[PDB]
């Protein structure tokens, strides 16, 4: 039933606040926690993300974490800032200065127990916890360094629960040069400790805004508008009744435990109505992917698609069948019937028709190679390593993270080349 939501660092809290804004509107929750919606379907699965409080207020099951205090002021002055449980704000007074080691071993490690005290509290109020979703970036210090520490600690305490992340991958187009360090060290943790990771690539988000949406200077608000749309569609199947929970969806999406990094896509892409053939086509188009990878460069292990709005499911079945058969060589033949479809009658805000793509594709190795090449260029010159080793890190942690990263890349390629 219940999902516990944790958002860490500036990016994690910024895209997290936007998520809660979007799905509150979808469910008819106002900034004061009152239900003001029309459809009873808005409340059927309201308890997945909200606790029903005393005066019938609906309160997000959300925990807000950062080492920087100014992040909590920004979220709190948001439209739904005073809807979060005030005691669920856990903030230090230092900041990590984009230093993974500070988030993971020093400042963040001094704050993690406070976060776990609040996590424990929320989990105790749950009737049947599904698991956890985390929002964070991989390129800073708090979201990446402390976020992965939080992941491991939560994994130790609740090992029989699903851990999913929405993980923002850094890009020089939206950028310091130590971000490949932070992301590599974080990916190392995500490989071992999460069940599903949605790879939200700032390189892809910038490209979409700059080249498709023709936004000359994309802002974080421009990038996060695509993120809030992606997070809404990815969680639709859990907020509006299939008989499938987080675990059932992981079992169908993850054939091998390490390869749990998803390329998300969305159609239509708009800035601040398509037909079913147009939704199906754009959903699989490389230009609609939230990870900067070309799916035609790899092969799909598993694919899930979620259509939203009133449409012909007869037509959806037909369009989804042809995009497989006509592109048959891009879906691995040793996983039969590996593309699943669901439809939700309720469309997102501002649209009558939309669709969300979730791909477990071996082409995701292009994202990991891009990070690894940047990491290696820096690491070969040993630039700024004392910044990290001054917080107690050994240099072997860097080499081990690089190595595991390249191992993950080689695993993707092996299954990309596998035959039946």
């Amino acid at each position: 039933r219940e999902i516990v939501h944790i958002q860490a660092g500036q990016c994690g809290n910024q895209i997290g606040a936007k998520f809660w804004e979007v799905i509150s509107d979808e469910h008819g929750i106002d900034p004061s926690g009152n239900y003001v919606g029309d459809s009873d379907l808005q409340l059927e699965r309201i308890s997945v993300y909200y606790n029903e409080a005393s005066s019938h207020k609906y309160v997000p099951r959300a925990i807000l974490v950062d080492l920087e205090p100014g992040t909590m002021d920004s979220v709190r002055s948001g439209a739904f800032g005073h809807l979060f449980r005030p005691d669920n704000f856990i903030f230090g007074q230092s900041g990590a200065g984009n230093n993974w080691a500070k988030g993971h071993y020093t400042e963040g490690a001094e704050l993690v127990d406070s976060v776990l005290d609040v996590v424990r509290k929320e989990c105790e109020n749950c009737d049947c916890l599904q698991g956890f979703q985390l929002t964070h970036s991989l390129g800073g210090g708090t979201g990446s360094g402390m976020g992965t520490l939080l992941i491991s600690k939560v994994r130790e305490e609740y090992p029989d629960r699903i851990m999913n992340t929405f993980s923002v991958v850094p890009s020089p187009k939206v950028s310091t040069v130590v971000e490949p360090y932070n992301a590599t060290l974080s990916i190392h943790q995500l490989v071992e400790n999460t069940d599903e990771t949605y790879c939200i690539d700032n390189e892809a988000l910038y490209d979409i805004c700059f080249r498709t949406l023709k936004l000359a200077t994309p802002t974080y608000g421009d990038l996060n508008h695509l993120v809030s749309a992606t997070m809404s569609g990815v969680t639709t199947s859990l907020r509006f009744p299939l008989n499938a929970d987080l675990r059932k969806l992981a079992v169908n999406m993850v054939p091998f435990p390490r390869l749990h990094f998803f390329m998300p896509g969305f159609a239509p892409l708009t800035a601040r109505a398509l037909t079913v053939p147009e939704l199906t086509q754009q959903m699989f188009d490389a230009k609609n992917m939230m990870a900067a990878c070309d799916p035609r460069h790899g092969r799909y292990l598993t694919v899930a698609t979620v259509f939203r709005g009133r449409m012909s499911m007869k037509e959806v079945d037909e369009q989804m069948l042809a995009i497989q058969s006509k592109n048959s060589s891009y879906f691995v033949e040793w996983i039969p019937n590996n593309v699943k479809v669901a439809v939700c009658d309720i469309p997102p805000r501002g649209l009558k028709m939309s669709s969300t793509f979730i791909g477990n594709s071996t082409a995701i190795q292009e994202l990991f190679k891009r990070i690894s090449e940047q990491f290696t260029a820096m690491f070969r010159r040993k630039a700024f390593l004392h910044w990290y080793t001054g917080e107690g890190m050994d240099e072997m942690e860097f080499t081990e993270a690089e190595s595991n990263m390249n191992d993950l890349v080689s695993e993707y390629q092996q299954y990309q080349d596998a035959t039946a």
Partner: protein, 424 residues
């Protein structure tokens, strides 16, 4: 001579709903158990006139059985015989069998024993479940193992939903299907498979339904189940569960009869011309009417039962059979070529909210044909494609199962396919 029906997982529960909905109508029982008795095999009677199904509904999550508890039949069943956990098997046989399923198995057996204790001569169980779900596969195999220990001399019959991609919600269903069949083969006496794709095509081609729902599929499935179990609920052939085994399973591992049903007519054709005994009999050897997609012309028959319902004269059945004998259905050389015949003279019933037209005559043919091995090969092939890369295996190994059980199950299946080839 009582029979207890057990429904496991989403598919088993929802098909159970349809079956008991049809049963009540066929016997004149209202949704509250009241009736303004041959059916005492399937319904107990309280000292107040209430007729209660001898039925258990089990699921590892509550929302499907919760609909039974609040729906039209909320007062039909024993409330304590509607049993739910909180966390389902996540399409994982290992969870249904080894970890989550064992949290509730003892409660389920104690509640079944409550029903059993009310029986003066229990014949055994009818178990309804999907192949593809984690509960339908895993918890069913666990329940069957336990039932064979605690009811050593009772018969156990299966109605099992064979998976189809058109309505499939799990890529791992081929795994669960093989795992459950391996661990159930020893414990099941006779198993009626229903291919969701076959029912799908019937609803599309015969009933004119573009996108069949689970409700459409399940009312059609309940019609075939009803024709199969009518002999137990009315007065000649297949009078007790053991007789199912005697008539349909001469070879104990080959216990998967093919069901074929006719006629299936859209409710929009209320004034259809009525088909004769000969015409509906002929329709039983048309692959379009089979519950499992396969080709009996390329198989051999080991046994064949014809169960008629309605305005059916025995001499017309005998003439229709004579045609069938002398016109390419081959029996094995070690069984009688004859066809067993049951006639239930009650007109077949249709649910008022159903998609079927009323018919004066219907027939369900049950034939043990080696041709159904084709359906095993299709599943096994899908199994082999994934297991060769060990895809999804880690989910099962992490939930109380050893990886060697995969290949142990697949080797059983290979031997089962060998059994079909040797007989054929």
């Amino acid at each position: 001579r009582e029979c207890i029906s057990i429904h496991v997982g989403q598919a088993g529960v929802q098909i159970g709903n349809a079956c008991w909905e049809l049963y009540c109508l066929e016997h004149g029982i209202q949704p509250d158990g009241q009736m303004p008795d041959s059916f005492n095999t399937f319904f107990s009677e309280t000292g107040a006139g209430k007729h209660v199904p001898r039925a258990v509904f089990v699921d590892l999550e509550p929302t499907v059985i919760d609909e039974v508890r609040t729906g039209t039949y909320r007062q039909l069943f024993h409330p304590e015989q509607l049993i739910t956990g909180k966390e389902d098997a996540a399409n994982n046989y290992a969870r249904g069998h080894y970890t989550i399923g064992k949290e509730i198995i003892d409660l389920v057996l104690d509640r079944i024993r409550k029903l059993a204790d009310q029986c003066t001569g229990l014949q055994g169980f009818l178990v309804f479940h999907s192949f593809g779900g984690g509960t339908g596969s895993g918890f069913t195999s666990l329940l069957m193992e336990r039932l064979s220990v605690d009811y050593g001399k009772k018969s156990k019959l299966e109605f099992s939903i064979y998976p189809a991609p058109q309505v499939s919600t799990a890529v791992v269903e081929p795994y669960n299907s093989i795992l459950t069949t391996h661990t159930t083969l020893e414990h099941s006496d006779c198993a009626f498979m229903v291919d969701n794709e076959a029912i799908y095509d019937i609803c599309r081609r015969n009933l004119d339904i573009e996108r069949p729902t689970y409700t459409n599929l399940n009312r059609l499935i309940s019609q075939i189940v009803s024709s199969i179990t009518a002999s137990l609920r009315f007065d000649a052939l297949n009078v007790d569960l053991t007789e199912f085994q005697t008539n349909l399973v001469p070879y104990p591992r080959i216990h998967f009869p093919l069901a074929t049903y006719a006629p299936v007519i859209s409710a929009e054709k209320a004034y259809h011309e009525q088909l004769s005994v000969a015409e509906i009999t002929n329709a039983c050897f048309e692959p379009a009417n089979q519950m499992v997609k396969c080709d009996p012309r390329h198989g051999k028959y080991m046994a064949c039962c014809l169960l008629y319902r309605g305005d059916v004269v025995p001499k017309d059945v005998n003439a229709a059979i004579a045609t069938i004998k002398t016109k390419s259905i081959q029996f094995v050389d070690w069984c009688p070529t004859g066809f067993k015949v049951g006639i239930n003279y009650q007109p077949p019933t249709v649910v008022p909210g159903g998609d079927l037209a009323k018919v004066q005559r219907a027939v369900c043919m049950l034939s043990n044909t080696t041709a159904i091995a084709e359906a095993w090969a299709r599943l096994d092939h899908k199994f082999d494609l994934m297991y060769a890369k060990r895809a999804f295996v880690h989910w099962y190994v992490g939930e109380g199962m050893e990886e060697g059980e995969f290949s142990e199950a697949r080797e059983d299946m290979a031997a089962l396919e060998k059994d079909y080839e040797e007989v054929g």
